[PDB]
């Protein structure tokens, strides 16, 4: 429930490792990277003048 | 297939001795004169030995007593 600005996501990965384990956080990181790529493509972010 | 070996790490905890144990078991199952104690899923002997370690039926002590038993048999 935040903006997830490259610091909350790293914190969430650290908490997932410290609380759950190694396989769940590996799967979580893979899913995060998948969904980040997918929704970055969906958003269509672009830089203009 | 085993993506991560954390269960094998926690079965006997060194992250270093498990390499030796799994290498010994893989040698036993690869050079011959041994069959896997866990169902074989067409994967290589390395992960078969690792899965045997993870499921708890392969460790140093029982490997040594198996060596002794086959030594006394012959």
Greatest contact between two chains: A-B, 4 and 3 residues
Strand content of chain B: under 5%
Biggest pleated-sheet summary of chain A: none
In terms of structural class, how would the helical and strand content of chain B be classed?
Answer: mainly alpha
Helix percent of chain B reads 55-70%
> What is the strand content of chain A?
under 5%
CA-based gyration radius of chain B = 12 Å
The H-and-E topology of chain B, N to C, reads as HHHH
- Structure class of chain A: mainly alpha
Shape estimate of chain B? globular
How can the largest sheet of chain B be summarized? none
Counting H and I runs of at least 4 residues, what is the number of helices of chain B?
4
Helicity level of chain A, as a percent range?
55-70%
PDB class: transcription
Keywords: initiation, rna polymerase, sigma54, transcription
Entry title: Cryo-EM structure of bacterial RNA polymerase-sigma54 initial transcribing complex - 7nt complex
Chain A: DNA-directed RNA polymerase subunit beta'
What does this structure look like?
In chain A, 67% of the residues lie in helices and 0% in strands. By secondary structure, chain A is mainly α. The radius of gyration of chain A is 13 Å and the shape is elongated. With 74 residues, chain B is mainly α. Helices cover 61% and strands 0% of the residues of chain B. Chain B has helices at residues 6-11, 17-31, 45-54, 60-73. Classes of the chains: A mainly alpha (49), B mainly alpha (74). Chain A binds chain B through residues 21-23, 26, and chain B through 3-4, 6.
Throw out a few tags for this protein.
part of a larger assembly, 2 chains, A: 49 residues, mainly alpha, 2 helices, elongated, B: 74 residues, 4 helices
